[PDB]
Amino acid sequence: MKIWSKEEVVNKLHEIKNKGYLSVPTDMFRTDDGVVGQILERQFGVQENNITLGDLGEFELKGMRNRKAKSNLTLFHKKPVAGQTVIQIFNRFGYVKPSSRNPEVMKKKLFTTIKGGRLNNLGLTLNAKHASEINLYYQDEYLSTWDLNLSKIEKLVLVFAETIGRANSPEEQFHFTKAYMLTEINDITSLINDGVLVMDLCIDQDLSKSKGPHDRGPHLRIPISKLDKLYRNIERLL
DNA sequence: AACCCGGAGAC
DNA sequence: CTCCGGGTTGT
Ligand SMILES: [Ca+2]
Ligand SMILES: [Ca+2]
Ligand SMILES: [Cl-]
């Protein structure tokens, strides 16, 4: 694994921007929102996930399309340590609905954003006692507990891409034009409780093809507009 | 299994 | 806010 110095990251980001629009190799294409991140990883020579460290060593690397209205940033995934499993949650709260991409395919889905301070429309909410005790509730009923490790996201390199071509098509291209270094992370207990950080569940199941469920892992996420609540220092790199 | 990489539109 | 995907890794 290469450990990238800050100066090496800054230099590489300028080189990447100077390359202009980057294309998706045919062998890579798989109708995938995450392709922006795969392309960015290639530029940094990131060959596999490391269980211990952020992609670049000291820093974790994240790419995003620069949409006018931006989806949340996914920080990492983690299964609950205790209580109901994600599959047990899916069994109870999932709902039958056609695929959004292919209307002829029937699915069972649970795509829901859960946060502190509020019940969502499915009755789900979070609270936190410590960063190591984040609890999922349905109304006043305790379901599950997460013990989250934030080590890998202590420092981030976040890079934004402009796009040309249809989203998730083989012709989509990416020009990485802006980047930020985010450091000095805050304790997350209050951020969970106040609904700044959120948890997404992203489980579905292809019923038409008689397949088993696909749990993508509970996602800890944050809106880009609220990153200054998570990190005390945000520096423009590119 | 349990992680990895990321999205959209309505009001 | 509700609602939404594509993978590989570890057993
Ligand atoms: Ca990684
Ligand atoms: Ca990453
Ligand atoms: Cl689980």
The CATH number covering residue A203 comes to: 3.30.70.3570
Experimental method: X-ray
DSSP class of A123: S
Range of the domain at A170: 2-70+149-186+224-238
Q: What backbone phi and psi angles, to 5 degrees, belong to A38?
A: -65, -40
Q: How far apart are CA A21 and CA A134, in angstroms?
A: 41
One domain for residues A163 and A209: no
One domain for residues A81 and A167: no
Strands A60-65 and A156-164: parallel
Q: How far apart are CA A118 and CA A137, in angstroms?
A: 11
Crossing angle of helices A35-43 and A6-18, in 10° steps, is: 110
Say whether A60 counts as a known binding-site residue: yes
Nucleotides of B under 7 A from a protein CB: 2-10
Structural tokens at position A118: 């509020």
Count of the separate structural domains present in chain A: 2
One domain for residues A144 and A155: no
Can you list the alpha helix ranges (DSSP code H) found in chain A? 6-18, 35-43, 86-93, 189-193, 227-230
One domain for residues A112 and A230: no
Q: How far apart are CA A51 and CA A151, in angstroms?
A: 11
Q: What backbone phi and psi angles, to 5 degrees, belong to A225?
A: -65, -15
Q: How far apart are CA A48 and CA A44, in angstroms?
A: 11
Q: How far is CA A236 from the centre of its chain?
A: 21
One domain for residues A84 and A139: yes
Q: How far is the CA of A144 from the centre of ligand 3 (A)?
A: 9
One domain for residues A171 and A229: yes
A95 CB burial (10 A radius; 0-12, 13-18, 19+): exposed
A204 touches strand B (CB under 7 A): no
Residue A226 CB neighbour total at 10 angstroms = 15
Strands A198-206 and A173-185: unpaired
User: Resolution of this PDB entry, in A?
Assistant: 1.5
Which residues, at least 6 apart from A189, have a Cβ–Cβ distance to it below 8 Å? Answer: A128, A129, A130, A131
One domain for residues A137 and A86: yes
One domain for residues A177 and A232: yes
